[PDB]
Amino acid sequence: ARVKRGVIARRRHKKILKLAKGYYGARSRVFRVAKQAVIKAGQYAYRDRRQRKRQFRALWIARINAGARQNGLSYSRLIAGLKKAAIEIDRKVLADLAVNEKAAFTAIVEKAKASLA
Amino acid sequence: VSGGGKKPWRQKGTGRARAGTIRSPIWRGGGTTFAAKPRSHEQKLNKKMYRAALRSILAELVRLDRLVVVADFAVDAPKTKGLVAKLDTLGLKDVLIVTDGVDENLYLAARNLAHVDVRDVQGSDPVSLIAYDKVLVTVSAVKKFEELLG
RNA sequence: UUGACUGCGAGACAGACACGUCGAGCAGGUACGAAAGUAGGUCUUAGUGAUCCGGUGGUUCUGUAUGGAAGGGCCAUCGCU
RNA sequence: CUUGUCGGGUAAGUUCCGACCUGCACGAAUGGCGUAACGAUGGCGGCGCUGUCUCCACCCGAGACUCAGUGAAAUUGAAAUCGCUGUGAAGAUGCAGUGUAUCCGCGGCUAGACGGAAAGACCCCGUGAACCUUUACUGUAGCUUUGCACUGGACUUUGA
RNA sequence: UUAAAAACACAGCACUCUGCAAACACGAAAGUGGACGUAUAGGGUGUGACGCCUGCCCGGUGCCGGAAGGUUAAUUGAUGG
RNA sequence: GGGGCUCAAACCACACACCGAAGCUGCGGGUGUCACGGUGACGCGGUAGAGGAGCGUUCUGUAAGCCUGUGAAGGUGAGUUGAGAAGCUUGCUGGAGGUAUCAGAAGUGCGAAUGCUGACAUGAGUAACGACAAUGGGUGUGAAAAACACCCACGCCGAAAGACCAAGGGUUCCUGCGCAACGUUAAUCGACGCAGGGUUAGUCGGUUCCUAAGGCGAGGCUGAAAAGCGUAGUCGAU
RNA sequence: AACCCACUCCCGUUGAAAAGGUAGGGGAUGACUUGUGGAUCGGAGUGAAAGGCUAAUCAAGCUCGGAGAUAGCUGGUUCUC
RNA sequence: GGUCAAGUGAAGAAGCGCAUACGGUGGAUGCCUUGGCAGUCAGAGGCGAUGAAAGACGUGGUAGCCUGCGAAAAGCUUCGGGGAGUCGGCAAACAGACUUUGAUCCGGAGAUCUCUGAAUGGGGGAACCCACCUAGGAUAACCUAGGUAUCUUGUACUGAAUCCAUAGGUGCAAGAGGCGAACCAGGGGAACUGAAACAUCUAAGUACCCUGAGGAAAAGAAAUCAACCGAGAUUCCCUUAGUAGUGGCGAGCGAACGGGGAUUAGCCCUUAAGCUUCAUUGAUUUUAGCGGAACGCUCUGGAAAGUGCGGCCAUAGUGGGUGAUAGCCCCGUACGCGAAAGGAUCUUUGAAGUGAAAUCGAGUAGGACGGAGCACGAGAAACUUUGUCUGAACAUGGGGGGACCAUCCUCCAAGGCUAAAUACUACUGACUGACCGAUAGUGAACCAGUACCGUGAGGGAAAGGCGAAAAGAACCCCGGAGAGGGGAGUGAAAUAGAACCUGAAACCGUAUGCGUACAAGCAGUGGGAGCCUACUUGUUAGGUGACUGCGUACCUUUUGUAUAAUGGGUCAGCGACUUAUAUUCAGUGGCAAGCUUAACCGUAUAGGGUAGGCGUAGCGAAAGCGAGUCUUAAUAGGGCGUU
Ligand SMILES: *C(=O)[C@H](CCSC)NC=O
Ligand SMILES: [Mg+2]
Ligand SMILES: [Mg+2]
Ligand SMILES: [Mg+2]
Ligand SMILES: [Mg+2]
Ligand SMILES: [Mg+2]
Ligand SMILES: [Mg+2]
Ligand SMILES: [Mg+2]
Ligand SMILES: [Mg+2]
Ligand SMILES: [Mg+2]
Ligand SMILES: [Mg+2]
Ligand SMILES: [Mg+2]
Ligand SMILES: [Mg+2]
Ligand SMILES: [Mg+2]
Ligand SMILES: [Mg+2]
Ligand SMILES: [Mg+2]
Ligand SMILES: [Mg+2]
Ligand SMILES: [Mg+2]
Ligand SMILES: [Mg+2]
Ligand SMILES: [Mg+2]
Ligand SMILES: [Mg+2]
Ligand SMILES: [Mg+2]
Ligand SMILES: [Mg+2]
Ligand SMILES: [Mg+2]
Ligand SMILES: [Mg+2]
Ligand SMILES: [Mg+2]
Ligand SMILES: [Mg+2]
Ligand SMILES: [Mg+2]
Ligand SMILES: [Mg+2]
Ligand SMILES: [Mg+2]
Ligand SMILES: [Mg+2]
Ligand SMILES: [Mg+2]
Ligand SMILES: [Mg+2]
Ligand SMILES: [Mg+2]
Ligand SMILES: [Mg+2]
Ligand SMILES: [Mg+2]
Ligand SMILES: [Mg+2]
Ligand SMILES: [Mg+2]
Ligand SMILES: [Mg+2]
Ligand SMILES: [Mg+2]
Ligand SMILES: [Mg+2]
Ligand SMILES: [Mg+2]
Ligand SMILES: [Mg+2]
Ligand SMILES: [Mg+2]
Ligand SMILES: [Mg+2]
Ligand SMILES: [Mg+2]
Ligand SMILES: [Mg+2]
Ligand SMILES: [Mg+2]
Ligand SMILES: [Mg+2]
Ligand SMILES: [Mg+2]
Ligand SMILES: [Mg+2]
Ligand SMILES: [Mg+2]
Ligand SMILES: [Mg+2]
Ligand SMILES: [Mg+2]
Ligand SMILES: [Mg+2]
Ligand SMILES: [Mg+2]
Ligand SMILES: [Mg+2]
Ligand SMILES: [Mg+2]
Ligand SMILES: [Mg+2]
Ligand SMILES: [Mg+2]
Ligand SMILES: [Mg+2]
Ligand SMILES: [Mg+2]
Ligand SMILES: [Mg+2]
Ligand SMILES: [Mg+2]
Ligand SMILES: [Mg+2]
Ligand SMILES: [Mg+2]
Ligand SMILES: [Mg+2]
Ligand SMILES: [Mg+2]
Ligand SMILES: [Mg+2]
Ligand SMILES: [Mg+2]
Ligand SMILES: [Mg+2]
Ligand SMILES: [Mg+2]
Ligand SMILES: [Mg+2]
Ligand SMILES: [Mg+2]
Ligand SMILES: [Mg+2]
Ligand SMILES: [Mg+2]
Ligand SMILES: [Mg+2]
Ligand SMILES: [Mg+2]
Ligand SMILES: [Mg+2]
Ligand SMILES: [Mg+2]
Ligand SMILES: [Mg+2]
Ligand SMILES: [Mg+2]
Ligand SMILES: [Mg+2]
Ligand SMILES: [Mg+2]
Ligand SMILES: [Mg+2]
Ligand SMILES: [Mg+2]
Ligand SMILES: [Mg+2]
Ligand SMILES: [Mg+2]
Ligand SMILES: [Mg+2]
Ligand SMILES: [Mg+2]
Ligand SMILES: [Mg+2]
Ligand SMILES: [Mg+2]
Ligand SMILES: [Mg+2]
Ligand SMILES: [Mg+2]
Ligand SMILES: [Mg+2]
Ligand SMILES: [Mg+2]
Ligand SMILES: [Mg+2]
Ligand SMILES: [Mg+2]
Ligand SMILES: [Mg+2]
Ligand SMILES: [Mg+2]
Ligand SMILES: [Mg+2]
Ligand SMILES: [Mg+2]
Ligand SMILES: [Mg+2]
Ligand SMILES: [Mg+2]
Ligand SMILES: [Mg+2]
Ligand SMILES: [Mg+2]
Ligand SMILES: [Mg+2]
Ligand SMILES: [Mg+2]
Ligand SMILES: [Mg+2]
Ligand SMILES: [Mg+2]
Ligand SMILES: [Mg+2]
Ligand SMILES: [Mg+2]
Ligand SMILES: [Mg+2]
Ligand SMILES: [Mg+2]
Ligand SMILES: [Mg+2]
Ligand SMILES: [Mg+2]
Ligand SMILES: [Mg+2]
Ligand SMILES: [Mg+2]
Ligand SMILES: [Mg+2]
Ligand SMILES: [Mg+2]
Ligand SMILES: [Mg+2]
Ligand SMILES: [Mg+2]
Ligand SMILES: [Mg+2]
Ligand SMILES: [Mg+2]
Ligand SMILES: [Mg+2]
Ligand SMILES: [Mg+2]
Ligand SMILES: [Mg+2]
Ligand SMILES: [Mg+2]
Ligand SMILES: [Mg+2]
Ligand SMILES: [Mg+2]
Ligand SMILES: [Mg+2]
Ligand SMILES: [Mg+2]
Ligand SMILES: [Mg+2]
Ligand SMILES: [Mg+2]
Ligand SMILES: [Mg+2]
Ligand SMILES: [Mg+2]
Ligand SMILES: [Mg+2]
Ligand SMILES: [Mg+2]
Ligand SMILES: [Mg+2]
Ligand SMILES: [Mg+2]
Ligand SMILES: [Mg+2]
Ligand SMILES: [Mg+2]
Ligand SMILES: [Mg+2]
Ligand SMILES: [Mg+2]
Ligand SMILES: [Mg+2]
Ligand SMILES: [Mg+2]
Ligand SMILES: [Mg+2]
Ligand SMILES: [Mg+2]
Ligand SMILES: [Mg+2]
Ligand SMILES: [Mg+2]
Ligand SMILES: [Mg+2]
Ligand SMILES: [Mg+2]
Ligand SMILES: [Mg+2]
Ligand SMILES: [Mg+2]
Ligand SMILES: [Mg+2]
Ligand SMILES: [Mg+2]
Ligand SMILES: [Mg+2]
Ligand SMILES: [Mg+2]
Ligand SMILES: [Mg+2]
Ligand SMILES: [Mg+2]
Ligand SMILES: [Mg+2]
Ligand SMILES: [Mg+2]
Ligand SMILES: [Mg+2]
Ligand SMILES: [Mg+2]
Ligand SMILES: [Mg+2]
Ligand SMILES: [Mg+2]
Ligand SMILES: [Mg+2]
Ligand SMILES: [Mg+2]
Ligand SMILES: [Mg+2]
Ligand SMILES: [Mg+2]
Ligand SMILES: [Mg+2]
Ligand SMILES: [Mg+2]
Ligand SMILES: [Mg+2]
Ligand SMILES: [Mg+2]
Ligand SMILES: [Mg+2]
Ligand SMILES: [Mg+2]
Ligand SMILES: [Mg+2]
Ligand SMILES: [Mg+2]
Ligand SMILES: [Mg+2]
Ligand SMILES: [Mg+2]
Ligand SMILES: [Mg+2]
Ligand SMILES: [Mg+2]
Ligand SMILES: [Mg+2]
Ligand SMILES: [Mg+2]
Ligand SMILES: [Mg+2]
Ligand SMILES: [Mg+2]
Ligand SMILES: [Mg+2]
Ligand SMILES: [Mg+2]
Ligand SMILES: [Mg+2]
Ligand SMILES: [Mg+2]
Ligand SMILES: [Mg+2]
Ligand SMILES: [Mg+2]
Ligand SMILES: [Mg+2]
């Protein structure tokens, strides 16, 4: 029972060369170089699913800070006032109200200022 | 493998990988690394394990309504038409016929019949009993099975 | 005066193994002391060399048909900067 | 030791020539000391001659350069392939900080790519390999000693 | 096929072996060369035209000679157990 | 680390606030062990290495079955399903074979070994085109002339770069027809392809006659065997 | 001069050439050069001696066998959870 | 609508990137096979001086090569078969023919059979040169047929030193010589390696070289073993048993006794079984052939064997191929028949030869020195054999029983012949395969031991597929009376067009869409505008990715590599934990104080065969004793063992 590897080896090569679509140069057309690029891309994707939550939290904070100072208060003083009184709205929704619903954001900030903090 | 009894090039200086013969398993026309030789794939099965297997199979044939027991079964003259008619009255198509002694006239028939095989009590292997859909045994052959298998 | 004894030996210390170290007590015979008793070398820790092979003294073993012998086994012991 | 010391040659001589004797460590057929002739032999010094040089200049042919035709090679993980100062498998195009910089050829030069070539020859290791040596060990061809055989007779001296 | 030389050879010198079926060399051997030669010849060794010369040591290791004594192989087999 | 910083954006004390990990909490999933009968509780980084469970390829049985010219294997896209190796359904090409399920045997899975064999890249349309005796016109043929043939005129060898024997080669010699490949360019030309033709001896060279070195060697001598030497003899030119 | 050789420089080093070329150079009646045929060879031959030469291979040729020698040493070792 | 100033900034690509669609190169993958590999059952086990194995040259209507033949040359003559086409293949075409008055074709026998090769008349560089004698025939410068090597054996003649005869010299007859893959019996005989070095030892009496014989060879009928009971020639298989021994007592080497089987057989020197060679009596095989049953209709389709419906044959139903898948289309298969003539085997009986050594075994048994073999390496070392040297007795005698002696037992050496069971396969035939399917399988599927490399010995390749059928593209146009194309025609299909099935990847192009000329780095990943396309008309799908946060490949080897340490130019194909025998542990099964067979027999996976192995009892070095035993003076202690 002699086994020939022609059919199965090709099927395995084409799976890698399909994930390497759009890569520059030999990284998309030769198996040896494309194999390393497909593995490295997977390492970056796993790592960058954690940075995505870091990158967006930094962006929301940078926007609540800019919008709170329009109303006369820093970011760190706004969080203390919100926590002291009652408000438990996320930084994702606070950043959205800062941009779109500027009238509601002012009402929230005046609630944090009124808490003496 | 023929030839290849000398080095192709010297050990050092050429710039090529190290080789000692052209008939190497790595080379194109080289030999097989673990080449086969003729060998026997026969196992050992105890006498009482072989008999305990027949006792196990023969019981299921009764439980699955596949063992048909008739009082004797003989056919005169070797004719495949004749045996086909005799097998039709019982409504049997795929049948193994087991008897104490295979008749000369009964062996000549069923030799060309498609899905019919004629055997002997000491000839019926474990594979044959399971392969066929129905098993036809004479009352005499039933007695023989009771003194070779206890 | 010969306990620098013979057969052992509960139980331990050390330790990869092979080796190593201490030892109450029992039985045979002993030596000192009037006797309880002490004595299985020296205040203790160094002073040493596996196996094979060959030699010597014993022996309720074996001994190539049988009776013996040769040879072998068991105990004691000798020969390696 | 040492470029020993003295003399000659040169403006100046670790080399050369002649001497001294303190011969680390000359020496008489593994010959000692001289020697005419000879040497594509080693060292030193002169005359002539000169682009060897100060210091290079011009000119003549063959390449190099452009056009038409044919058409290799070593090398190569992949490249969107800068400088500096640090860090770092301790000498960075690729890391950190920073500074410069539009995209692409052609003719030239070789400072880096620890550039290409050859599984370092130097050094060490392997209870590795060859060949060589001897008063290493163990043998051996050859040479030689004696007993027996082929191989006998007689006489004589001496021994039991 | 990176060394042409002071390296090798050389004429000349010396020591030593060889009496002929020569020493010596190639051959399990027959045989062959030496040599169809015969010590003014043949082999080995060292030095190296020519001139003047070549000094002391025989303790070591070689070679040559000697035969008295001491040791000493196969072989033989008295005696003893 | 840079910009830049002096009642500091430096240092010393005290106070409150915030940022900040894959840590902890929240929500949704998957697994290992233990206990009770699906629930709870504690876990789930990993090299050498131990243990457990699986995917896929070729062949055999199930299978004289099932699928298939109303289109098999193979190739190439798309969509979709799992935790993974992987599975499934279809468009185009293809043109005759494939193997459900469960078992059984392996030449059973490749990116490396300066690995082996083919094909194809980079260097790159880059180096080089093989003595620096040297070429310039006219004509002709031709699809096409720097190179072919002829004519005029230049250069080079001439103790050869001329002529002839031996060895060696073996049709390369001549003619007619050709230019794919060979010719380091083109070719109408050729030592290239095809097809015909061409080598005439008493005196030339061999053979026949004779021998040298040397070879073989009837008998013979010697040697485990193969064989060695050698007499008569008979081969061997230069 | 021919012929044999190979002392110097430069070029060439992917060469016109796996050892050449152009300029000069040594011997050139002799221990000379050369053609043809023959003899000696692998622990063996031959060597005016360089461990040199024995078919571009020599501190022991090439070829086929023992043989897949041995390698405590480098290198490589292929699907998933 | 103006002039000026400030700000802002679309398009415009020499070239390039990504995606997609089409090509090119290239030859993988799939499917296939006229070629290999490995078995089982038979055959016959040699050919050659009557010229072998291996060749050179010639032979055809035309050039070459292969295959056959040999100046009588793809053939000549006779027999036997059949039953109509044929003049071999690459390899087709054009002519000449052959024939039912029996061709080509197949088998038996016969004739011819160039030159070289043991090569054999003498030489020689193989395929060449030069001869002699006899018989016959020509008359010129020859032709036809025979012979002429060497050695061994027998025979006839003759005759050296030397008188006789010995050596020798001639002529006759018969035999040998060379080749071949393995097997068999002898002669000579390594090393690497192992012992983790290496000498004894091992590897191993292996590899290799040489000599003879046969289809088999060899060995064979007790001067053998056993143990006081017995067996009964040799050979091969399973155990005994990796035991007793042997061994720098190291690495290692390794029996026998006794059991179970395959085969059956002995006979002579007061002359036999047997073996050859003829001559007969019969039978069987072999070298070629003959017959050999049963299917129609319909649908798709280029084509039916395939769909649907209904039958028939069977001692023939998983054979090959025919335009796709056939028991009934063809060739076959099961099953019956067949030999003018050759070969072989087994057979009865006549003969000749041999067996064959004459009369029971003397330089023999035994002994001393040096070796070899025995499992046994000098060891207490018995036994066989012999290079050197010696050396008996005669059945009241001799050999052996593992140093040696005594007693018992058992055989008769120094003379011969003998089948079967056993080993092998270069060679031929039949069947089969959980073997390969063109980088695999033979080095070789094809004009392969070829091309090519080497002075030689020697080494040694690459290279398969149109279609069912050549129907292989008439004719026109461009082009050099080209190459190559565009049409037209054949075909189911020419992107099946002869480099022809399918036709991937690397690599090279054309076309469209988006991005790209102020920008610094493993080329990605997270966020993300704009543009283009499709359509479900924007919480959508596909292509592109301006700008921006993080971000120094893979393998190996290491204490540690982005490392400027290794390896890789890329793609495709191949490429590394296997197999046999002995065992130990675990899982899972069959029997159970028992379990299980090996060789072998056999209907041959059954069944038989329980020789043997393990277990039910241990202790001791052993005799031995045994729920105990050993140590010891010891029923003390202690070691090991027992429910
Ligand atoms: C020593 O420095 C060595 C010289 C060796 S000569 C055999 N280095 C060489 O490069
Ligand atoms: Mg991209
Ligand atoms: Mg691509
Ligand atoms: Mg790859
Ligand atoms: Mg071969
Ligand atoms: Mg070889
Ligand atoms: Mg080999
Ligand atoms: Mg070899
Ligand atoms: Mg290299
Ligand atoms: Mg090898
Ligand atoms: Mg291979
Ligand atoms: Mg390969
Ligand atoms: Mg092969
Ligand atoms: Mg059985
Ligand atoms: Mg049947
Ligand atoms: Mg303790
Ligand atoms: Mg006491
Ligand atoms: Mg007292
Ligand atoms: Mg005895
Ligand atoms: Mg006895
Ligand atoms: Mg004794
Ligand atoms: Mg000095
Ligand atoms: Mg001075
Ligand atoms: Mg002066
Ligand atoms: Mg000077
Ligand atoms: Mg002197
Ligand atoms: Mg000297
Ligand atoms: Mg001196
Ligand atoms: Mg002198
Ligand atoms: Mg002297
Ligand atoms: Mg001198
Ligand atoms: Mg002098
Ligand atoms: Mg000179
Ligand atoms: Mg001088
Ligand atoms: Mg000067
Ligand atoms: Mg010039
Ligand atoms: Mg150009
Ligand atoms: Mg730049
Ligand atoms: Mg640093
Ligand atoms: Mg740095
Ligand atoms: Mg980087
Ligand atoms: Mg950086
Ligand atoms: Mg930086
Ligand atoms: Mg440039
Ligand atoms: Mg330069
Ligand atoms: Mg440079
Ligand atoms: Mg460098
Ligand atoms: Mg190497
Ligand atoms: Mg190295
Ligand atoms: Mg050295
Ligand atoms: Mg050592
Ligand atoms: Mg070591
Ligand atoms: Mg002697
Ligand atoms: Mg000279
Ligand atoms: Mg010299
Ligand atoms: Mg002399
Ligand atoms: Mg000298
Ligand atoms: Mg002296
Ligand atoms: Mg003296
Ligand atoms: Mg003397
Ligand atoms: Mg302050
Ligand atoms: Mg977090
Ligand atoms: Mg967590
Ligand atoms: Mg949870
Ligand atoms: Mg884990
Ligand atoms: Mg964790
Ligand atoms: Mg199957
Ligand atoms: Mg289709
Ligand atoms: Mg398949
Ligand atoms: Mg498909
Ligand atoms: Mg698909
Ligand atoms: Mg078809
Ligand atoms: Mg088919
Ligand atoms: Mg299956
Ligand atoms: Mg594999
Ligand atoms: Mg690959
Ligand atoms: Mg890997
Ligand atoms: Mg590779
Ligand atoms: Mg390489
Ligand atoms: Mg190019
Ligand atoms: Mg360039
Ligand atoms: Mg250039
Ligand atoms: Mg150029
Ligand atoms: Mg030129
Ligand atoms: Mg040139
Ligand atoms: Mg030229
Ligand atoms: Mg002209
Ligand atoms: Mg012209
Ligand atoms: Mg010209
Ligand atoms: Mg002139
Ligand atoms: Mg000629
Ligand atoms: Mg020609
Ligand atoms: Mg011509
Ligand atoms: Mg012409
Ligand atoms: Mg042209
Ligand atoms: Mg041309
Ligand atoms: Mg021509
Ligand atoms: Mg002559
Ligand atoms: Mg002569
Ligand atoms: Mg001779
Ligand atoms: Mg002779
Ligand atoms: Mg002559
Ligand atoms: Mg002659
Ligand atoms: Mg002549
Ligand atoms: Mg000449
Ligand atoms: Mg010379
Ligand atoms: Mg020189
Ligand atoms: Mg010059
Ligand atoms: Mg000259
Ligand atoms: Mg010159
Ligand atoms: Mg001179
Ligand atoms: Mg001169
Ligand atoms: Mg001469
Ligand atoms: Mg020779
Ligand atoms: Mg030499
Ligand atoms: Mg040479
Ligand atoms: Mg040698
Ligand atoms: Mg050697
Ligand atoms: Mg060679
Ligand atoms: Mg050679
Ligand atoms: Mg090897
Ligand atoms: Mg070996
Ligand atoms: Mg690795
Ligand atoms: Mg394509
Ligand atoms: Mg057979
Ligand atoms: Mg032929
Ligand atoms: Mg004739
Ligand atoms: Mg006829
Ligand atoms: Mg002849
Ligand atoms: Mg002859
Ligand atoms: Mg002749
Ligand atoms: Mg013969
Ligand atoms: Mg021998
Ligand atoms: Mg050895
Ligand atoms: Mg071993
Ligand atoms: Mg060893
Ligand atoms: Mg070793
Ligand atoms: Mg060693
Ligand atoms: Mg050995
Ligand atoms: Mg015969
Ligand atoms: Mg016989
Ligand atoms: Mg007898
Ligand atoms: Mg016997
Ligand atoms: Mg008896
Ligand atoms: Mg020892
Ligand atoms: Mg029929
Ligand atoms: Mg059919
Ligand atoms: Mg029909
Ligand atoms: Mg005879
Ligand atoms: Mg006699
Ligand atoms: Mg007798
Ligand atoms: Mg004897
Ligand atoms: Mg003796
Ligand atoms: Mg002996
Ligand atoms: Mg012995
Ligand atoms: Mg011993
Ligand atoms: Mg004797
Ligand atoms: Mg005897
Ligand atoms: Mg005896
Ligand atoms: Mg016999
Ligand atoms: Mg092949
Ligand atoms: Mg294929
Ligand atoms: Mg091949
Ligand atoms: Mg197509
Ligand atoms: Mg087609
Ligand atoms: Mg093609
Ligand atoms: Mg095609
Ligand atoms: Mg087809
Ligand atoms: Mg492609
Ligand atoms: Mg485009
Ligand atoms: Mg700027
Ligand atoms: Mg831009
Ligand atoms: Mg850049
Ligand atoms: Mg930057
Ligand atoms: Mg950069
Ligand atoms: Mg995104
Ligand atoms: Mg979109
Ligand atoms: Mg992005
Ligand atoms: Mg980015
Ligand atoms: Mg970054
Ligand atoms: Mg690596
Ligand atoms: Mg390292
Ligand atoms: Mg390190
Ligand atoms: Mg790092
Ligand atoms: Mg790297
Ligand atoms: Mg780098
Ligand atoms: Mg390095
Ligand atoms: Mg690296
Ligand atoms: Mg390395
Ligand atoms: Mg390294
Ligand atoms: Mg590399
Ligand atoms: Mg059990
Ligand atoms: Mg006890």
Q: Which nucleotides in chain G lie less than 7 Å from some protein C-beta?
A: 63-65, 67-68
**A1 Cα: distance to centroid of ligand 69 (angstroms):** 12
Distance CA A21, CA B113 (A): 62
A6 touches strand H (CB under 7 A): yes
Residue B18 DSSP symbol? P
Resolution of the model in angstroms: 2.9
Distance CA B29, CA B35 (A): 14
Strand partners, B120: B99
For residue A17, how many C-alpha atoms fall within 13 Å in the half-sphere facing its CB?
12
Q: Is A34 exposed, middle or buried (0-12, 13-18, 19+ CB in 10 A)?
A: buried
Query: Which nucleotide is closest, CA of B25 to its C1'?
Result: H575
**B70 Cα: distance to centroid of ligand 111 (angstroms):** 130
**B52 Cα: distance to centroid of ligand 99 (angstroms):** 96
Strand partners, B116: B95
Q: Residues B75, B86: contact at Cβ < 8 Å?
A: yes
Query: Which nucleotide is closest, CA of A81 to its C1'?
Result: F17
Q: Which nucleotides in chain H lie less than 7 Å from some protein C-beta?
A: 17-20, 28-30, 38-39, 313-318, 434-437, 439-444, 449, 459-462, 504-507, 522-527, 543-545, 549-550, 553-554, 568, 570-580, 589-591, 595-598, 603, 605-610
Secondary element (H or E) of residue A55 = helix A31-70
Of B109, B99, B120, nearest to B75 by C-alpha is B109
Query: Which nucleotide is closest, CA of B5 to its C1'?
Result: G64
Q: Residues B84, B113: contact at Cβ < 8 Å?
A: yes
Name the residues in A52-91 having a C-beta closer than 7 Å to nucleic acid strand F: 53-54, 57-58, 61, 75-77, 79-80, 83
Distance CA B141, CA B103 (A): 13
